Design a protein around this nucleic acid. Sequence first.
RNA 1: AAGCGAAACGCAGCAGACCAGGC
Lengths: 51, 51
Amino acid sequence: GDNTKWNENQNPRMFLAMITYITRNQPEWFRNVLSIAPIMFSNKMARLGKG
Amino acid sequence: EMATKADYTLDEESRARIKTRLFTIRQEMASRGLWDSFRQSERGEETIEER
RNA sequence: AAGCGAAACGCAGCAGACCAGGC
Ligand SMILES: [Mg+2]
């Protein structure tokens, strides 16, 4: 079976937490470059569209 | 000047001009007191990683 | 056996006195 509302419930903060845990002990620049994506996605704004 | 097989491929005037240029550079550098610094060479130090 | 995005750059010595000491 599938998972209902998969995209609507996968919070970007969780991906940030996973990226931080995965990048443990790695150089700080690597952690920053990898963690920038979840940070921007957590602040993302959706354009409504054509109207 | 030293050339393979002692063949300099150029007339004495051209080589004399280039040597003169080299000398002019030598005197110009020596006047500013930077020749001694330039004397020592084998410069090879780098540290920049990623920030 | 495996397989992906199928140019130019290692110094250098006084020497000669006199004293104390070592087996
Ligand atoms: Mg003895």
